[PDB]
Coordinates of C-alpha atoms and ligand atoms in Angstrom, one line a residue:
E1426 CA -3.7 2.4 -25.9
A1427 CA -0.9 4.9 -25.5
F1428 CA -2.0 7.6 -23.0
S1429 CA -5.7 7.2 -23.5
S1430 CA -8.9 7.6 -21.5
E1431 CA -9.8 3.9 -21.7
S1432 CA -6.5 2.1 -21.5
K1433 CA -5.9 0.7 -17.9
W1434 CA -2.2 1.4 -18.5
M1435 CA -0.8 4.9 -18.9
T1436 CA 1.9 3.5 -21.3
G1437 CA -0.7 1.5 -23.2
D1438 CA -0.2 -1.8 -24.9
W1439 CA 3.3 -1.0 -26.3
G1440 CA 2.1 -1.4 -29.8
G1441 CA 0.6 -4.8 -29.1
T1442 CA 3.5 -6.5 -27.3
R1443 CA 1.9 -6.0 -23.9
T1444 CA -1.3 -7.7 -25.1
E1445 CA 0.7 -10.6 -26.5
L1446 CA 2.6 -11.1 -23.3
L1447 CA -0.8 -11.2 -21.6
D1448 CA -2.0 -13.9 -23.9
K1449 CA 1.2 -15.9 -23.3
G1450 CA 0.5 -15.6 -19.5
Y1451 CA 2.6 -12.5 -18.5
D1452 CA 0.9 -9.6 -16.7
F1453 CA 3.5 -6.9 -15.9
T1454 CA 2.4 -4.0 -13.8
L1455 CA 3.8 -0.8 -12.3
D1456 CA 1.4 0.9 -10.0
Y1457 CA 1.8 4.3 -8.2
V1458 CA 0.1 5.7 -5.1
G1459 CA 0.8 9.2 -3.9
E1460 CA -0.6 10.7 -0.7
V1461 CA -0.4 14.4 0.4
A1462 CA -1.5 15.6 3.9
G1463 CA -1.5 19.1 5.4
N1464 CA -2.9 20.2 8.8
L1465 CA -5.5 22.9 8.7
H1466 CA -6.5 23.0 12.4
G1467 CA -5.7 21.4 15.7
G1468 CA -3.7 18.4 16.6
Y1469 CA -0.6 18.4 18.8
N1470 CA 1.4 21.0 16.8
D1471 CA -0.6 23.6 15.0
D1472 CA 2.2 25.0 12.8
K1473 CA 0.8 24.5 9.3
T1474 CA 2.9 22.4 7.0
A1475 CA 2.4 19.6 4.5
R1476 CA 3.7 16.1 4.0
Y1477 CA 4.0 13.8 1.1
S1478 CA 4.4 10.0 0.9
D1479 CA 4.2 7.6 -2.0
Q1480 CA 4.7 4.1 -3.2
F1481 CA 5.7 2.3 -6.5
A1482 CA 4.7 -1.3 -6.9
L1483 CA 6.4 -3.4 -9.6
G1484 CA 4.7 -6.7 -10.4
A1485 CA 4.9 -9.9 -12.4
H1486 CA 1.9 -12.2 -12.6
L1487 CA 2.5 -15.5 -14.3
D1488 CA -0.1 -17.9 -15.7
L1489 CA 2.0 -21.1 -15.0
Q1490 CA -0.5 -23.2 -16.9
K1491 CA 0.3 -21.5 -20.2
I1492 CA 4.0 -21.0 -19.3
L1493 CA 4.8 -24.3 -17.6
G1494 CA 1.7 -26.6 -18.2
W1495 CA 0.9 -26.6 -14.5
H1496 CA -2.9 -26.8 -14.2
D1497 CA -4.3 -23.7 -12.7
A1498 CA -1.1 -22.6 -11.2
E1499 CA 0.0 -18.9 -10.7
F1500 CA 3.2 -17.2 -9.7
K1501 CA 3.4 -13.6 -8.5
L1502 CA 6.4 -11.3 -7.9
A1503 CA 5.9 -7.9 -6.4
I1504 CA 8.5 -5.3 -5.3
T1505 CA 7.7 -2.0 -3.7
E1506 CA 9.6 1.2 -2.8
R1507 CA 8.1 3.9 -0.7
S1508 CA 9.2 7.4 0.0
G1509 CA 8.3 10.4 2.1
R1510 CA 7.1 11.7 5.4
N1511 CA 3.9 11.4 7.5
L1512 CA 1.8 14.3 8.9
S1513 CA 0.6 12.1 11.7
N1514 CA 4.1 12.0 13.2
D1515 CA 5.3 15.4 12.2
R1516 CA 2.3 17.5 13.4
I1517 CA -0.8 15.6 14.7
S1518 CA 0.7 13.2 17.4
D1519 CA 1.8 13.8 20.9
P1520 CA 5.4 12.8 20.5
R1521 CA 5.2 10.4 23.4
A1522 CA 1.8 8.9 22.3
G1523 CA 1.5 8.8 18.6
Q1524 CA -1.7 8.5 16.6
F1525 CA -2.9 4.9 16.1
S1526 CA -4.3 5.5 12.7
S1527 CA -2.5 7.6 10.1
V1528 CA -3.6 10.4 7.7
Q1529 CA -1.4 8.9 5.0
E1530 CA -2.0 5.2 4.8
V1531 CA 0.7 4.7 2.2
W1532 CA 3.5 5.7 4.6
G1533 CA 5.2 3.2 6.8
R1534 CA 7.4 0.1 7.3
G1535 CA 10.7 1.8 6.5
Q1536 CA 10.4 3.9 3.3
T1537 CA 12.7 1.6 1.3
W1538 CA 12.7 -1.3 -1.2
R1539 CA 10.9 -4.4 -0.1
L1540 CA 10.1 -7.9 -1.5
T1541 CA 6.4 -7.5 -1.1
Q1542 CA 5.1 -10.6 -2.8
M1543 CA 6.6 -13.8 -4.1
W1544 CA 4.3 -16.8 -4.2
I1545 CA 3.1 -19.7 -6.2
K1546 CA -0.5 -20.9 -6.1
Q1547 CA -2.4 -24.0 -7.3
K1548 CA -6.1 -25.0 -7.3
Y1549 CA -7.4 -28.6 -7.3
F1550 CA -10.7 -30.3 -8.0
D1551 CA -12.1 -27.6 -10.2
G1552 CA -11.0 -24.8 -7.9
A1553 CA -12.5 -26.3 -4.8
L1554 CA -9.1 -26.4 -3.0
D1555 CA -6.7 -23.5 -3.2
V1556 CA -3.1 -23.8 -2.0
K1557 CA -0.8 -20.8 -1.9
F1558 CA 2.8 -20.7 -0.7
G1559 CA 5.6 -18.2 -0.5
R1560 CA 5.9 -14.6 0.7
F1561 CA 3.1 -12.1 1.3
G1562 CA 1.3 -10.3 4.2
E1563 CA -1.7 -11.6 6.1
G1564 CA -4.0 -8.9 4.8
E1565 CA -3.7 -10.1 1.2
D1566 CA -6.0 -13.1 2.0
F1567 CA -7.2 -12.5 5.5
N1568 CA -9.4 -9.7 6.9
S1569 CA -9.0 -8.1 3.5
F1570 CA -10.5 -4.6 2.8
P1571 CA -9.9 -2.2 -0.1
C1572 CA -7.7 0.9 0.1
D1573 CA -9.4 3.9 -1.5
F1574 CA -9.5 6.1 1.6
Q1575 CA -6.4 8.0 2.6
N1576 CA -6.8 7.3 6.3
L1577 CA -5.4 4.0 7.6
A1578 CA -8.5 3.2 9.5
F1579 CA -10.4 2.8 6.2
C1580 CA -7.7 1.1 4.2
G1581 CA -6.5 -2.5 4.2
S1582 CA -6.6 -5.2 6.9
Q1583 CA -7.5 -3.5 10.2
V1584 CA -6.2 -6.4 12.3
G1585 CA -2.9 -5.4 10.6
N1586 CA -3.2 -1.9 12.0
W1587 CA -4.2 -2.6 15.6
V1588 CA -1.9 -5.8 16.1
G1589 CA 0.6 -4.5 13.6
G1590 CA 3.4 -5.3 16.0
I1591 CA 3.2 -9.0 14.9
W1592 CA 0.8 -9.0 11.9
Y1593 CA 2.3 -7.3 8.9
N1594 CA 0.4 -6.3 5.8
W1595 CA 1.6 -5.2 2.4
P1596 CA 4.3 -4.1 1.9
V1597 CA 6.0 -6.5 4.3
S1598 CA 6.4 -10.1 3.2
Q1599 CA 6.9 -13.3 5.3
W1600 CA 7.0 -17.0 4.6
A1601 CA 3.5 -18.2 4.5
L1602 CA 1.1 -21.0 3.6
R1603 CA -2.6 -20.4 3.0
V1604 CA -5.1 -23.2 2.3
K1605 CA -8.5 -22.3 1.0
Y1606 CA -11.6 -24.4 0.5
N1607 CA -14.3 -23.1 -1.8
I1608 CA -17.5 -24.7 -0.5
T1609 CA -19.8 -22.8 -2.8
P1610 CA -19.1 -20.2 -5.4
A1611 CA -20.2 -17.6 -2.8
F1612 CA -18.8 -19.1 0.4
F1613 CA -15.3 -20.1 1.4
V1614 CA -13.3 -21.0 4.5
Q1615 CA -9.5 -20.6 4.9
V1616 CA -6.7 -21.0 7.4
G1617 CA -3.0 -20.0 7.1
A1618 CA 0.3 -20.2 8.8
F1619 CA 2.6 -17.1 8.7
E1620 CA 6.2 -16.9 9.9
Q1621 CA 6.1 -14.2 12.5
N1622 CA 9.5 -12.4 12.5
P1623 CA 9.9 -8.8 13.7
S1624 CA 13.3 -8.6 12.0
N1625 CA 11.3 -8.3 8.7
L1626 CA 10.4 -4.8 9.9
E1627 CA 14.1 -3.7 10.1
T1628 CA 15.4 -1.7 7.2
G1629 CA 18.0 -3.8 5.5
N1630 CA 15.6 -6.8 5.6
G1631 CA 13.3 -5.6 2.9
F1632 CA 14.5 -8.6 0.8
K1633 CA 15.2 -11.0 3.6
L1634 CA 14.6 -14.7 2.7
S1635 CA 16.2 -16.3 5.8
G1636 CA 14.0 -17.4 8.6
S1637 CA 16.3 -16.1 11.4
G1638 CA 14.7 -14.0 14.1
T1639 CA 11.4 -16.0 13.9
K1640 CA 9.5 -15.6 17.2
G1641 CA 6.6 -17.9 16.3
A1642 CA 3.8 -18.2 13.9
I1643 CA 0.5 -16.4 13.2
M1644 CA -2.4 -18.6 12.4
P1645 CA -5.4 -16.9 10.9
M1646 CA -8.8 -18.6 10.2
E1647 CA -11.6 -17.1 8.2
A1648 CA -15.1 -17.6 6.7
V1649 CA -16.0 -15.4 3.8
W1650 CA -19.6 -15.2 2.6
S1651 CA -20.4 -13.3 -0.7
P1652 CA -24.1 -13.5 -1.2
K1653 CA -26.3 -11.4 -3.4
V1654 CA -28.8 -9.3 -1.5
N1655 CA -31.5 -7.9 -3.9
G1656 CA -29.4 -8.8 -6.9
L1657 CA -26.6 -6.7 -5.3
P1658 CA -23.1 -8.0 -4.3
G1659 CA -22.0 -8.2 -0.7
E1660 CA -19.1 -9.8 1.2
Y1661 CA -19.1 -10.8 4.9
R1662 CA -16.0 -12.0 6.7
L1663 CA -15.7 -13.6 10.1
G1664 CA -12.2 -14.5 11.4
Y1665 CA -9.9 -15.4 14.3
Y1666 CA -6.1 -15.3 14.6
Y1667 CA -3.7 -17.0 17.0
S1668 CA -0.1 -16.1 17.4
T1669 CA 2.5 -18.5 18.8
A1670 CA 5.1 -15.8 19.7
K1671 CA 5.7 -14.5 23.3
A1672 CA 4.0 -11.2 24.1
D1673 CA 4.3 -9.0 27.2
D1674 CA 1.4 -8.2 29.5
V1675 CA 0.3 -4.6 29.4
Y1676 CA 0.3 -4.3 33.2
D1677 CA 1.4 -7.3 35.3
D1678 CA 5.1 -7.8 36.0
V1679 CA 6.6 -11.3 36.1
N1680 CA 5.2 -11.7 39.7
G1681 CA 1.7 -10.3 39.2
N1682 CA 2.4 -7.0 40.8
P1683 CA 1.8 -3.8 38.8
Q1684 CA 5.0 -3.4 36.8
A1685 CA 4.8 0.5 37.0
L1686 CA 5.5 0.1 40.7
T1687 CA 8.3 -2.5 40.4
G1688 CA 10.2 -1.8 37.2
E1689 CA 10.6 -5.5 36.8
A1690 CA 10.0 -7.3 33.5
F1691 CA 6.4 -7.7 32.3
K1692 CA 4.7 -11.0 32.7
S1693 CA 5.1 -12.9 29.4
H1694 CA 2.2 -14.8 27.7
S1695 CA 2.8 -17.7 25.2
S1696 CA 0.4 -16.1 22.7
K1697 CA -1.9 -13.4 21.4
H1698 CA -5.3 -13.9 19.8
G1699 CA -8.3 -12.0 18.4
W1700 CA -11.4 -11.9 16.2
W1701 CA -12.7 -9.7 13.3
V1702 CA -15.6 -9.0 11.1
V1703 CA -15.7 -7.4 7.7
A1704 CA -18.9 -6.5 6.0
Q1705 CA -19.5 -4.7 2.7
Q1706 CA -22.8 -4.5 0.9
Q1707 CA -24.2 -2.8 -2.1
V1708 CA -27.6 -1.5 -1.2
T1709 CA -28.8 0.4 -4.3
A1710 CA -28.4 0.3 -8.1
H1711 CA -28.5 3.8 -9.4
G1712 CA -31.3 4.0 -12.0
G1713 CA -30.9 0.3 -12.5
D1714 CA -27.2 0.5 -13.2
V1715 CA -25.4 -2.1 -11.1
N1716 CA -22.1 -0.2 -11.6
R1717 CA -23.5 2.8 -9.7
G1718 CA -25.3 3.3 -6.4
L1719 CA -24.7 3.2 -2.6
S1720 CA -22.4 0.7 -0.8
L1721 CA -22.2 0.4 3.0
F1722 CA -19.3 -1.0 4.9
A1723 CA -18.2 -1.9 8.4
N1724 CA -15.3 -3.4 10.3
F1725 CA -15.0 -4.6 13.9
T1726 CA -12.0 -5.9 15.6
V1727 CA -11.3 -7.4 19.1
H1728 CA -8.0 -8.3 20.7
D1729 CA -6.7 -10.0 23.8
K1730 CA -6.9 -7.7 26.9
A1731 CA -3.7 -9.3 28.2
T1732 CA -1.2 -8.0 25.7
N1733 CA -2.8 -5.8 23.0
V1734 CA -2.7 -2.0 23.3
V1735 CA -5.8 -1.5 21.1
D1736 CA -8.6 -3.3 23.0
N1737 CA -11.2 -3.2 20.3
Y1738 CA -12.1 -1.2 17.2
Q1739 CA -15.1 -0.3 15.1
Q1740 CA -15.6 1.3 11.8
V1741 CA -18.7 2.3 9.8
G1742 CA -18.9 4.1 6.4
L1743 CA -20.3 4.3 2.9
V1744 CA -19.3 5.0 -0.6
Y1745 CA -21.5 6.1 -3.6
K1746 CA -20.5 5.4 -7.1
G1747 CA -21.9 7.7 -9.8
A1748 CA -24.2 10.0 -7.9
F1749 CA -24.3 12.2 -11.0
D1750 CA -25.1 11.1 -14.6
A1751 CA -22.3 13.4 -15.8
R1752 CA -19.6 11.6 -13.8
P1753 CA -20.8 8.0 -13.6
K1754 CA -17.4 6.5 -12.6
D1755 CA -16.7 9.0 -9.8
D1756 CA -17.1 8.1 -6.1
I1757 CA -18.0 9.7 -2.8
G1758 CA -16.7 8.2 0.4
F1759 CA -17.4 8.7 4.1
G1760 CA -16.1 6.7 7.1
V1761 CA -16.0 6.9 10.8
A1762 CA -13.7 4.7 13.0
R1763 CA -13.3 4.3 16.8
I1764 CA -10.1 2.9 18.2
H1765 CA -10.3 2.0 21.9
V1766 CA -7.2 1.6 24.1
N1767 CA -6.9 -1.3 26.6
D1768 CA -7.8 0.3 30.0
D1769 CA -4.9 -1.4 31.8
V1770 CA -2.5 0.5 29.5
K1771 CA -4.0 3.7 30.8
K1772 CA -4.0 2.4 34.4
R1773 CA -0.3 1.6 34.1
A1774 CA 0.3 5.1 32.8
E1775 CA -1.6 6.7 35.7
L1776 CA 0.6 4.7 38.0
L1777 CA 3.8 5.9 36.2
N1778 CA 2.7 9.5 36.7
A1779 CA 1.8 8.9 40.3
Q1780 CA 5.2 7.4 41.0
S1781 CA 7.2 10.0 39.1
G1782 CA 5.3 12.7 40.9
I1783 CA 4.6 14.3 37.6
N1784 CA 1.0 15.3 37.1
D1785 CA 1.1 18.1 34.5
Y1786 CA 0.4 17.0 30.9
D1787 CA 2.7 19.7 29.6
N1788 CA 5.7 18.3 31.3
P1789 CA 7.8 16.1 29.0
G1790 CA 8.2 13.4 31.7
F1791 CA 4.4 13.1 32.0
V1792 CA 3.0 10.0 30.3
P1793 CA -0.2 10.7 28.4
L1794 CA -3.4 8.8 29.2
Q1795 CA -4.4 6.9 26.1
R1796 CA -8.2 6.4 25.9
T1797 CA -10.1 6.5 22.6
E1798 CA -9.1 7.9 19.1
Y1799 CA -11.7 8.6 16.4
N1800 CA -11.1 9.0 12.7
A1801 CA -13.3 10.2 9.9
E1802 CA -12.8 10.8 6.2
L1803 CA -14.9 12.3 3.5
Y1804 CA -13.5 12.0 -0.1
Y1805 CA -14.3 12.5 -3.7
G1806 CA -12.7 10.3 -6.4
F1807 CA -12.3 11.8 -9.9
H1808 CA -12.1 9.1 -12.5
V1809 CA -9.7 10.9 -14.7
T1810 CA -8.8 7.9 -16.9
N1811 CA -8.9 4.1 -16.5
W1812 CA -5.2 4.5 -15.4
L1813 CA -5.6 7.6 -13.2
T1814 CA -7.8 8.4 -10.2
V1815 CA -7.4 11.5 -8.1
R1816 CA -9.2 11.8 -4.8
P1817 CA -9.1 14.9 -2.6
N1818 CA -10.3 14.1 1.0
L1819 CA -11.0 15.7 4.3
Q1820 CA -10.0 14.0 7.5
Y1821 CA -11.0 14.6 11.1
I1822 CA -9.3 13.1 14.1
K1823 CA -10.7 13.2 17.7
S1824 CA -8.1 12.5 20.4
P1825 CA -5.0 11.6 18.3
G1826 CA -3.3 8.7 20.0
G1827 CA -6.4 8.4 22.3
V1828 CA -5.1 11.5 24.1
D1829 CA -8.0 13.8 25.1
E1830 CA -5.4 16.6 25.8
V1831 CA -4.7 16.9 22.0
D1832 CA -7.0 19.1 20.1
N1833 CA -9.1 17.7 17.3
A1834 CA -7.2 17.7 14.0
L1835 CA -8.6 18.8 10.6
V1836 CA -6.5 17.5 7.8
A1837 CA -6.6 18.1 4.1
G1838 CA -5.5 15.2 1.9
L1839 CA -5.0 14.3 -1.7
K1840 CA -4.7 10.8 -2.8
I1841 CA -3.5 9.7 -6.3
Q1842 CA -3.7 6.2 -7.8
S1843 CA -2.1 5.3 -11.2
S1844 CA -1.1 2.3 -13.2
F1845 CA 1.5 2.6 -15.8
Ligands
DMU1360 C1 1.3 16.5 -5.0 C2 2.5 16.6 -4.2 C3 3.0 17.9 -3.6 C4 4.0 18.0 -2.6 C5 3.6 18.3 -1.1 C6 4.6 18.2 0.0 O1 5.7 19.0 0.0 C7 6.6 19.1 1.1 O2 6.2 20.3 1.8 C8 7.2 20.8 2.9 C9 6.9 22.1 3.2 O3 5.6 22.4 3.5 C10 8.7 20.6 2.5 O4 9.5 20.5 3.7 C11 10.4 21.6 4.0 O5 9.7 22.9 4.1 C12 9.2 23.5 5.4 C13 9.6 24.8 5.5 O6 9.1 25.6 6.5 C14 9.5 22.7 6.7 O7 8.4 22.5 7.4 C15 10.2 21.3 6.4 O8 10.9 20.9 7.6 C16 11.0 21.3 5.3 O9 11.7 20.0 5.2 C17 8.9 19.4 1.7 O10 10.3 19.6 1.0 C18 8.0 19.1 0.6 O11 8.3 17.8 0.0
DMU1361 C1 -4.1 -30.3 -0.1 C2 -4.3 -30.2 -1.6 C3 -4.7 -31.5 -2.3 C4 -4.0 -31.8 -3.6 C5 -4.4 -33.1 -4.4 C6 -4.2 -33.1 -5.9 C7 -5.3 -33.8 -6.8 O1 -5.6 -33.2 -8.1 C8 -6.7 -33.4 -8.8 O2 -6.9 -34.8 -9.2 C9 -8.2 -35.2 -10.0 C10 -8.1 -36.4 -10.5 O3 -7.0 -36.8 -11.3 C11 -8.4 -34.1 -11.1 O4 -9.7 -34.2 -11.7 C12 -9.7 -34.3 -13.1 O5 -9.3 -35.7 -13.3 C13 -10.2 -36.8 -13.9 C14 -9.6 -37.3 -14.9 O6 -8.3 -37.7 -14.8 C15 -11.6 -36.3 -14.2 O7 -12.5 -37.3 -13.8 C16 -12.0 -35.0 -13.5 O8 -13.2 -34.5 -14.1 C17 -11.0 -34.0 -13.7 O9 -11.5 -32.7 -13.2 C18 -8.1 -32.7 -10.7 O10 -8.1 -31.8 -11.9 C19 -6.9 -32.5 -9.9 O11 -6.9 -31.1 -9.4
DMU1362 C1 -18.1 14.4 12.0 C2 -18.0 15.5 13.0 C3 -18.0 15.2 14.5 C4 -17.9 16.3 15.5 C5 -17.7 15.9 17.0 C6 -16.9 16.9 17.9 C7 -16.5 16.5 19.3 O1 -15.3 16.9 19.9 C8 -15.1 17.0 21.3 O2 -16.0 18.0 21.9 C9 -15.8 18.3 23.3 C10 -16.3 19.5 23.6 O3 -17.7 19.6 23.7 C11 -14.3 18.3 23.8 O4 -14.3 18.0 25.2 C12 -13.5 18.9 25.9 O5 -13.7 20.2 25.4 C13 -14.3 21.4 26.1 C14 -13.5 22.4 26.1 O6 -13.8 23.6 26.8 C15 -14.6 21.0 27.6 O7 -15.7 21.7 28.1 C16 -14.9 19.6 27.8 O8 -15.1 19.2 29.2 C17 -13.8 18.8 27.4 O9 -14.0 17.3 27.7 C18 -13.5 17.2 23.1 O10 -12.1 17.3 23.4 C19 -13.7 17.2 21.7 O11 -12.8 16.2 21.1
DMU1363 C1 -14.8 12.0 14.1 C2 -15.9 11.4 15.1 C3 -16.0 12.0 16.4 C4 -16.4 11.2 17.7 C5 -16.9 11.9 18.9 C6 -16.7 11.3 20.3 C7 -17.0 12.2 21.5 C8 -16.8 11.7 22.9 O1 -15.7 12.2 23.7 C9 -15.3 11.4 24.9 O2 -15.2 12.4 26.0 C10 -14.9 11.6 27.3 C11 -15.0 12.5 28.3 O3 -15.7 13.7 28.2 C12 -13.5 10.9 27.2 O4 -13.4 10.0 28.3 C13 -12.5 10.3 29.2 O5 -12.0 11.6 29.1 C14 -11.9 12.6 30.3 C15 -10.7 13.1 30.2 O6 -10.4 13.8 29.1 C16 -12.2 12.0 31.6 O7 -12.6 12.9 32.5 C17 -13.3 10.9 31.5 O8 -13.5 10.3 32.8 C18 -13.0 9.9 30.6 O9 -14.1 9.0 30.5 C19 -13.3 10.3 25.8 O10 -11.9 10.2 25.4 C20 -14.1 10.6 24.7 O11 -14.6 9.3 24.1
C8E1364 C1 1.6 -25.1 -4.2 C2 2.5 -25.2 -5.4 C3 2.4 -26.5 -6.2 C4 3.1 -26.3 -7.5 C5 3.5 -27.7 -8.1 C6 2.9 -27.9 -9.5 C7 3.2 -29.3 -10.1 C8 4.3 -29.1 -11.2 O1 4.5 -30.3 -11.9 C9 3.3 -30.6 -12.7 C10 3.6 -31.7 -13.8 O2 2.4 -31.8 -14.6
C8E1365 C1 10.9 8.3 -5.3 C2 10.1 9.5 -4.7 C3 10.6 10.9 -5.1 C4 9.5 11.8 -5.5 C5 9.2 11.8 -7.0 C6 7.8 11.5 -7.4 C7 7.5 11.4 -8.9 O1 6.5 10.5 -9.2 C8 5.3 11.1 -9.6 C9 4.4 10.0 -10.3 O2 3.1 10.5 -10.6 C10 2.3 9.8 -11.5 C11 1.2 10.6 -12.1
C8E1366 C1 -14.3 -18.2 13.5 C2 -13.4 -18.6 12.3 C3 -14.2 -19.6 11.4 C4 -13.5 -20.9 11.2 C5 -13.4 -21.2 9.7 C6 -11.9 -21.7 9.4 C7 -11.9 -23.2 9.0 C8 -10.6 -23.6 8.5 O1 -10.6 -23.9 7.1 C9 -9.7 -24.9 6.7 C10 -9.7 -25.2 5.2 O2 -9.3 -26.4 4.9
C8E1367 C1 -14.6 14.2 7.9 C2 -14.4 15.7 7.8 O1 -15.3 16.4 8.5 C3 -14.8 17.4 9.3 C4 -15.9 18.0 10.1 O2 -15.4 19.0 11.0 C5 -16.1 19.1 12.2 C6 -15.8 20.3 13.0 O3 -16.9 20.6 13.8 C7 -16.7 20.3 15.2 C8 -15.7 21.2 15.9 O4 -16.3 22.4 16.1 C9 -16.9 22.6 17.4 C10 -17.0 24.1 17.6 O5 -17.0 24.8 16.4
C8E1368 C1 -20.4 18.8 -13.2 C2 -18.9 18.7 -13.2 O1 -18.4 17.8 -12.1 C3 -18.7 18.4 -10.9 C4 -17.4 18.3 -10.0 O2 -17.7 17.5 -8.9 C5 -17.5 18.2 -7.6 C6 -16.0 18.4 -7.3 O3 -15.8 18.3 -5.9 C7 -14.6 17.8 -5.5 C8 -14.2 18.6 -4.2 O4 -13.1 19.4 -4.5
C8E1369 C1 -7.7 18.5 -1.1 C2 -8.4 19.0 0.1 C3 -9.8 19.5 -0.2 C4 -10.8 18.6 0.6 C5 -11.6 17.7 -0.3 C6 -13.1 17.8 -0.2 C7 -13.8 16.5 -0.3 C8 -15.2 16.5 0.2 O1 -16.2 16.7 -0.8 C9 -17.2 15.7 -0.9 C10 -18.6 16.3 -1.3 O2 -18.5 17.0 -2.5 C11 -19.7 16.9 -3.3 C12 -19.5 17.2 -4.8 O3 -20.7 17.6 -5.4 C13 -21.0 16.9 -6.6 C14 -21.1 17.7 -7.8 O4 -21.4 17.0 -9.0 C15 -22.6 17.3 -9.6 C16 -22.5 17.0 -11.1 O5 -23.1 17.9 -11.9
BGC1370 O1 1.9 -2.9 6.7 C1 0.7 -2.5 6.9 C2 0.4 -1.1 6.7 O2 1.5 -0.3 7.4 C3 1.4 1.1 7.2 O3 2.5 1.8 7.7 C4 1.3 1.4 5.8 O4 1.2 2.8 5.6 C5 0.2 0.8 5.1 O5 0.2 1.2 3.7 C6 0.3 -0.7 5.3 O6 -0.9 -1.2 4.6

């Protein structure tokens, strides 16, 4: 401890008192994430600049069994503040049809202070049933995926990205109940009910506890299989979500006519719904070391054609830990994602342009045809200490916002992760 290579905290164990608190059931954490991005070539605006965005996360993890005598119970408090600007908005995107993904995943949801987690959790029958209640985002339990890449498409719950209008990951919180049945040490099922309340997105409501503005509920379900394949760990997720809030059609007006022709309100549907798959698998163990080798990953996502802008999404990638004996804790990442836009969204746009008489893409009143956006990242993670990782990355974006008229973007990124 103190500032050392093997402490998982930069400030160490505070002369022992941190390790005591840990024994007594208290785990206090202060985690930092900084992301830099600068355009090197292409995208909507080719004036070269750089943007920086970051996040602090202050946490309190309580073992309520030691502290209160409550048999496997846990409390968690997390507060975040985020700061900075996003390259995706400021250079890459068409201003009237912004990028779906983002070259700085850590940016978004208001750049302020938020209550990001506040929940109590208890297990029953030797950890067979797991009940969790309080405030958190869907991605924390459902459709969960790590966040080492800088590009949004390869970080966190993807359902949270493409139906992010109602499903809100970290750092947004909402009242929620999540019930989990562990059928087998390597297989579980789970369902949840999340307050769905767009006012949580408004700056000012970073610490909202009231249920005012609730539009309905999101109800995710999931099966998560974590088998060993050839002695190597994998994790496979299959899920479905259902949302009880009203959503607008992407094309039909209230009468079933194309709304681009009428200007009347969109037809309203009483719900949204979709499915997802997450798969991650370690496929090699470098020279017999389980802690090194090649891991593959994939994500697929599918959404209701009626209301969702993103039709479907796919992502494939890999990461190698410890390619070289010299740097056994370093990693190499590569990922490709495809984000397809609901064709009716495009059809509606073609109609708009037809009716405004504006057919030139360079005309501000023209409404870009959104088709398919691709993202790719290649990164290298230096394991500086156990409390510091630094990963430069290279990002490539084909048709930002799905707009073929926007040149491919080459972006340079630097992602930093540290725990104090
Ligand atoms: C590791 C972290 C290193 C920090 C990288 C990001 O730095 C940003 O770079 C911009 C510059 O590239 C600055 O913006 C300023 O500088 C430019 C000047 O031309 C303008 O594009 C901007 O509008 C203007 O706000 C901005 O202050 C600065 O935070
Ligand atoms: C929806 C969620 C459902 C919540 C229901 C709460 C029930 O709690 C369980 O009750 C068992 C019975 O009391 C306990 O088993 C324990 O209790 C017995 C002794 O009292 C032993 O036979 C068991 O081995 C021992 O694990 C067990 O720990 C406890 O979690
Ligand atoms: C990992 C690395 C992957 C590399 C893949 C690069 C593909 O980029 C596309 O290539 C086309 C070019 O072949 C472009 O089409 C456009 O570009 C040309 C420009 O002259 C036209 O001839 C085409 O018709 C037109 O569709 C298109 O926009 C561009 O996004
Ligand atoms: C990083 C990973 C790189 C991934 C590389 C993918 C290259 C394929 O590019 C395609 O080109 C089509 C056309 O060439 C486009 O379709 C549409 O685009 C044209 C207009 O730009 C229309 O003429 C077509 O009818 C229409 O199918 C479409 O957006 C795009 O998928
Ligand atoms: C889902 C939260 C459940 C927490 C209640 C724990 C029970 C506290 O009293 C235990 C008495 O022993
Ligand atoms: C609040 C955001 C203002 C920018 C200051 C960033 C300073 O934090 C750097 C932390 O790096 C840890 C290593
Ligand atoms: C296609 C989704 C798979 C359905 C599994 C969810 C089952 C709900 O679990 C309830 C736990 O109690
Ligand atoms: C992920 C980072 O990879 C970036 C790869 O850049 C690809 C550029 O090559 C395709 C564009 O060039 C076409 C004509 O030169
Ligand atoms: C041998 C020392 O370690 C080699 C450095 O690894 C390559 C760094 O590449 C990162 C891209 O900037
Ligand atoms: C900060 C923007 C710069 C772009 C980052 C580039 C990341 C892509 O590089 C990944 C591949 O680099 C391979 C490193 O070679 C390994 C050297 O280690 C050998 C040990 O002796
Ligand atoms: O709320 C979900 C997601 O929204 C994005 O704006 C943030 O940059 C992500 O860090 C976050 O995971």
